[PDB]
Design a protein around this nucleic acid. Structure first.
Lengths: 65, 65, 271, 100, 116, 88
RNA sequence: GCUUGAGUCUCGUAGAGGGGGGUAGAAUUCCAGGUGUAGCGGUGAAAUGCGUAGAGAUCUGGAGGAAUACCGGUGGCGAAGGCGGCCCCCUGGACGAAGACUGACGCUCAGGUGCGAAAGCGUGGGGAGCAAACAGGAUUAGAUACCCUGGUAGUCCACGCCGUAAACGAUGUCGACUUGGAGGUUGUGCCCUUGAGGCGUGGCUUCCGGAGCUAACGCGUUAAGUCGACCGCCUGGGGAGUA
RNA sequence: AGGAGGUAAAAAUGUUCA
């Protein structure tokens, strides 16, 4: 949101902007209100997240590689 | 990973800006619990601490002031 | 109390009576009264200048202190009255030195409260004090235009003006209609709003209900002949004319404002 | 009676006239038998963000214990006194005395 | 003319265009250039290359003032936003500090439902 | 909502002593004390619907007890309704 | 009579539980003024629309209304509907701890009564944004739709009404019994807090799964498992949840 | 390994029984 690298930089190098928000919340408060999908798609979000966590502890098969 | 008042119990104060600014990014956002490794109970008091101190102009709402 | 009557007869089935049980059920203070005759809408020349006025119930004039020139003399609200010359109710206050006066009754002001005027007034409803002592954003009523003039704006039932900004010697108020006037800072204003805000919920019901308020039958210009009203004429309710007053001036959208000496104070016109 | 942790900031220029004020507010409180715990006057420090304009205001903490009636007496003297800007009252939790 | 030494460049990068203007530190504008006036009508109007020439044609018209160092305040998400500053870096100016002044609300007024 | 001293007053009054805190007489008077105090709350507000449901609960809890007391001991029941001021 | 049912009292704990009153910051729109100039906005493309009267952009100041970014998590609370910026006042419920007390006061409940998203209706205010209807421009064989620019009711507040939702874990309520694993959350006791802790004990809650159960899917100690008490409800499709 | 920005204007219909 604010960078200087005071004197010797000569290059953008601003990864700091994307680390805060800058676009994740703009392409969210851009449109599509709902008041419904939030609880729907985010209950959908971590539903699949726990199963990737499940097979994280479930890839102990052989498969030969 | 790290811990706080979870072991050495203490009440999170809002006048204490020293320990409070560790939980605030350069933008002026409240960091999530999924990073600082704090407990849920102490987190809520900490969230209330930020909102109280922000009202008393001790912490910025954003860095564009 | 917005109470609706019961249809025991036609013309009583629509009447909505606004009753206030706190209103003194006796006689007003004799010294502060004076007669008030009916004009009938007839001026010096005896001609009816303002139409639809006459009859009504005979009523007396209760001299109300709008000015409020007393300073630092705490008074107590004795009783709430009914005033047939207003829209709001009047409170008969009693000062410390034994003086009795009639004032407009604000919203939150029950008989037995304590008010006072002057620059040493605490910010409490009923208290009158110059506008550079009243906080900006506050709600006032019975506000003046000229210092010590008296108070003209916001005087009817449930009315109030809002102090929206203050710069130097001129304080801008937002009137009840939406106008944004400017005013001298020495103008005294009374805190709170004007009480009896349920006045507008009252429906008259009977045609005679209006007849004793003093109003008189209003005749539509279409019903008349062309010699009486620009509209008139016709052989079966014909109109075909641009709506005007009985004096040929275009009504329904035609600004008649032309003062020019007072527009210096007026910032924003209503909308 | 309940404890309170009121915090009120005063205008910079009016900070030269503030000391007498603290003793004025406490007088009405102890007049009603309200016990005082702290009186920590922080001092004129920087306002993180502009408040109605003009930053760098003067902070005053009181930390009072008093009856419920005298506080609305006290907070009404905050709304209508434009010298003091942005006041705030809080909860008890057995008022303390040490931190700064 | 006035010969202003320093200046602040502003970049309003939206999803269908980018209007980059150059003002001084006091806010009074001294010239601008859009991707919509550099030709590019339609699909090319929302491209980083169009943001490049916009920064170039804004590098001109401010020559009368000739500002050395330049503060950069980019605003809004979109196709430009980054190609407008790299083109402005090679424009010859001295980029002092780059900042992001995107107008993020705290759940204020309600955004449209459009798009299907 | 019944401060501790008010609770302590009624409990040692309608029963044997401070030890007596669970008897039926004690309960009815103590509940009535809360309802009489809560009557002031719903005098105004009129729309605090959630807390009201808490009131109606203790109302019927009182009525369950009184119907028990009458069914078990009409003697003390008659003396309780006259000392508390209810039961038409 | 008695106590393991039920309920009460003393001490503490967590929470978007509820009602009322103030307050704050970002942002949107609008208004006034300075700088400055041909586009702006929109889209698959485009056009209507806004614009040399001088927009958009930028800076300063002002007025309003509504919603509360981050914290925020298959996290918490509530009977359900549902409720989250901050603070104050009034106030409900739930849980835990070591005890005392009353002594079956209980479970359920046709009819009855109350609460009950949204939309809608009435009276009176308010009205930024969003947006039915409507209009215009496109798309199209047509487009009274999808998309775009505008836009009224409505959405907000107070007081009444309506009583309906896929009001749904599509699973009625209370109570007892029947292998475990891993997390979340909130109380509590003991041990060396010897160091982000170790071992038991309660309530709520999520995922995976054993027996059993099921038409199968799946449920699986918060059961659709094994039983008990009461209530509501179903009897082929359509007609019709209509006359 | 863990998280953010970007990624399809238009295309209707198919007689009856077996």
């Amino acid at each position: 949101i604010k960078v200087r690298e005071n004197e010797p930089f000569d290059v953008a190098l601003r990864r700091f902007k994307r680390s805060c928000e800058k676009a994740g919340v703009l392409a969210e408060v851009r449109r599509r209100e709902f008041y419904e999908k939030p609880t729907t798609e985010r209950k959908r979000a971590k539903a699949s997240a726990v199963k990737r966590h499940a097979k994280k502890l479930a890839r102990e098969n052989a498969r030969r590689t | 990973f790290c811990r706080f008042t979870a072991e050495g119990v203490q009440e999170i104060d809002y006048k204490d800006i020293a320990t409070l600014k560790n939980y605030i990014t350069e933008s002026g956002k409240i960091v999530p619990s999924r990073i600082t490794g704090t407990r849920a109970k102490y987190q809520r008091q900490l969230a209330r601490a930020i909102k109280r101190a922000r009202y008393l102009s001790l912490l910025p709402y954003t860095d564009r002031h | 109390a917005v109470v609706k009557c019961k249809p025991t007869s036609p013309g009583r089935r629509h009447v909505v009576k606004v009753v206030n049980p706190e209103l003194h059920k006796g006689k007003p203070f004799a010294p502060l009264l004076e007669k008030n005759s009916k004009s009938g809408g007839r001026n010096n020349n005896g001609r009816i200048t303002t139409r639809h006025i006459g009859g009504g119930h005979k009523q007396a004039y209760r001299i109300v202190d709008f000015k409020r020139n007393k300073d630092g003399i705490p008074a107590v609200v004795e009783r709430l009255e009914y005033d047939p010359n207003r829209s709001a109710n009047i409170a008969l206050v009693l000062y410390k030195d034994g003086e009795r006066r009639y004032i407009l009754a604000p919203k939150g002001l029950k008989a037995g409260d304590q008010i006072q005027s002057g620059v040493d007034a605490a910010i409490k409803p009923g208290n009158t004090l110059p506008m550079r002592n009243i906080p900006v954003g506050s709600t006032v009523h019975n506000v003046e235009m000229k210092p010590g003039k008296g108070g003209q704006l916001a005087r009817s039932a449930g009315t109030y003006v809002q102090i929206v900004a203050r710069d130097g010697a001129y304080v801008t108020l937002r009137l009840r209609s939406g106008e944004m006037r400017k005013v001298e800072a020495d103008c005294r204003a009374t805190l709170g709003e004007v009480g009896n805000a349920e006045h507008m919920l009252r429906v008259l019901g009977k045609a005679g209900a209006a007849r004793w308020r003093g109003v008189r039958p209003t005749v539509r210009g279409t019903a008349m002949n062309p010699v009486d009203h620009p509209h008139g004429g016709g052989e079966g309710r014909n109109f075909g004319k641009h709506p005007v007053t009985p004096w040929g001036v275009q009504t329904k959208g035609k600004k008649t404002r032309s003062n020019k000496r007072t527009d210096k104070f007026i910032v924003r016109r209503r909308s | 009676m309940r404890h309170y942790e009121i915090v009120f900031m005063v205008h910079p220029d009016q900070s030269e006239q503030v000391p007498g004020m603290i003793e004025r507010y406490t007088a009405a409180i102890t007049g009603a038998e309200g016990k005082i715990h702290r009186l920590e006057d922080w001092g004129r420090r920087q306002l993180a963000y502009p408040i109605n304009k003009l930053h760098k205001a003067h902070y005053v903490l009181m930390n009072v214990e008093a009856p419920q009636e005298v506080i609305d007496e006290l907070e009404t003297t905050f709304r209508f006194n434009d010298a003091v800007i942005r006041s705030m009252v809080m909860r008890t939790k057995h008022a303390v005395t040490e931190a700064s | 003319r006035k010969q202003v030494s320093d200046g602040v460049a502003h970049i309003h990068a939206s999803f269908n265009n980018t209007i980059v203007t150059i003002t001084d530190r006091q806010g009074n504008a001294l010239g601008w250039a859009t991707a919509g006036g550099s030709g590019f009508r339609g699909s090319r109007k929302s491209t980083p290359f169009a943001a490049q020439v916009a920064a170039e044609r804004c590098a001109d018209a401010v020559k009368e003032y000739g500002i050395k160092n330049l503060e950069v305040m980019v605003k809004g998400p979109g196709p430009g936003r980054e190609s407008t500053i790299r083109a402005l870096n090679a424009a010859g100016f001295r980029i002092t500090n780059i900042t992001d002044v995107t107008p993020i609300p705290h759940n204020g007024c309600r955004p449209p439902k459009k798009r299907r | 909502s019944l401060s501790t001293e008010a609770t302590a007053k009624i409990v040692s009054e309608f029963g044997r002593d401070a030890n007596d805190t669970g008897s039926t007489e004690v309960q009815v008077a103590l509940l009535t004390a809360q309802i009489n105090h809560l009557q002031g709350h719903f005098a105004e507000h009129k729309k605090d619907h959630h807390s009201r449901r808490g009131l109606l609960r203790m109302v019927s809890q009182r009525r369950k007890l009184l119907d028990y007391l009458k069914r078990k001991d009409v003697a003390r029941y008659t003396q309780l309704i006259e000392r508390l001021g209810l039961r038409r």
